[PDB]
RNA sequence: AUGAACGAGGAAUUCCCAGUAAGUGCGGGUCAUAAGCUUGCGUUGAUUAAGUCCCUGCCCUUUGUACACCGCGUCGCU
RNA sequence: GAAACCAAAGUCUUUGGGUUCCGGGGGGAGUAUGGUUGCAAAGCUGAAACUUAAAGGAAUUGACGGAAGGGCACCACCAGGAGUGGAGCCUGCGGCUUAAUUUGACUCAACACGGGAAACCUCACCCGGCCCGGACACGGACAGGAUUGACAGAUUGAUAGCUCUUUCUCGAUUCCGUGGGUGGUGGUGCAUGGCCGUUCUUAGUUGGUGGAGCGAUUUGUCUGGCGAUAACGAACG
């Protein structure tokens, strides 16, 4: 509804919503480091959204 | 600082092309800043890319 | 009659008048009669003086050629900011 | 009386090399009534460096330099 | 000599030793046609129609390098200091409402700036009311009045004659139109001046003389890691 997703500093998340996104961020990072072969190099909170 | 992000809702192609991408109902265009003078730091990663 | 201006666009301006030294084309159902033609345009001065006004040749009988009549309106401009004007009247 | 947030502050960023920052008040301007602003003045008063082009800009110098070509089309009548 | 350059490309307007070939702005075009040679491909000779105001030659600088070096500065950095950004709040900005929440200003070169800490004034903005402070000249009206001011009541926020009633004052000091002057914190700072800010608190700017070149131009305004040194002097900063 053209509202974009919120950032991962501004989502107020539960603890283990808190350590499943750790978890997500974590797969992610392996994934593009030895899938992708490339490194983000400006990964932070201001570069990640939550969304579902 | 570098790029603009913006909500936009796209349309719906009439072309029966059986190659043609699916366009999202949302979607968001980023165009890079090309009349500001801060983007002369941004040299260091894109001097070492063996691609370009 | 119309009169028009005789240049080679497809739209023609109205003449409101006839000018002396501007040759106009003169529009008007008449019966359809193959060029060339001399043509001569007369009035009734007074008492029944045929007066001659204006001559010329018959160009090619279309209905296609149009006749655009125009207007003008005026306003004076009382507020000019740059690129940026308010108008009034 | 009322007593809140505020537990030294992410990303990011400003000013500053000695009676200097910073602390501290005072006076002038404003001003009928008036300073959190501003312009000045004294008081207390340090750590770091005697450098660099790493960032941002700015500045010069020398070297040459007065849109070249090869890779937009088919059909239709008067 | 146009110069690059050339002891010939010299002895050329101070033009004449002998002789051969060959060029006449650029394209079309070394094309078509014809002749001739050739096995052939081709060669030799070789137009025109039409088309354009340039095509070209030497030398001189450099706008610009997507070319490389230095050098500068706590409005850049290192070592740090004290901070802002995080709290409450004061004041300026926008967004939002409001009749108005006037306005100028938007990177450093706007944002406690407009000396702008505005209860009235300021004040431009909103609502309401009052006055002419229409100078001046012309025409008309006007002394048997052109007018001004005003008690009381109605109205009014207003001891606002602002309008009416009530009729009391005033002696051309005028009034109505015509032209036309003033008055504006009204609009253009992208029409101006002045002043200010900025580039830039930079480190440059311009002249004169001498020498090279026909000239554009060059040397000066300087190669080097003492020494070369056609250059020398000024002025502003």
Known sequence: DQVPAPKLKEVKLNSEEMKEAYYQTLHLMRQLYHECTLVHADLSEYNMLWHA | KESVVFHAYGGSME?????????????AIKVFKTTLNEFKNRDKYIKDDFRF | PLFSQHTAADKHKLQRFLTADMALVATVY????????????????????????????????????????????????????????????
């Open chain 2, 15 to 27: 072309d029966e092309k059986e190659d043609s991408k699916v366009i999202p109902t949302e979607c």
């Open chain 3, 30 to 89: 008449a019966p359809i009669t193959f060029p060339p033609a001399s043509v001569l345009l007369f009035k009734q001065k007074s008492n029944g003086m045929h007066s001659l006004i204006a001559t010329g040749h018959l160009m090619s009988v279309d209905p296609d050629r149009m006749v655009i009549k125009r207007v003008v309106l005026s306003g004076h401009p009382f507020k000019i900011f740059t690129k940026m004007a308010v108008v009034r009247y």
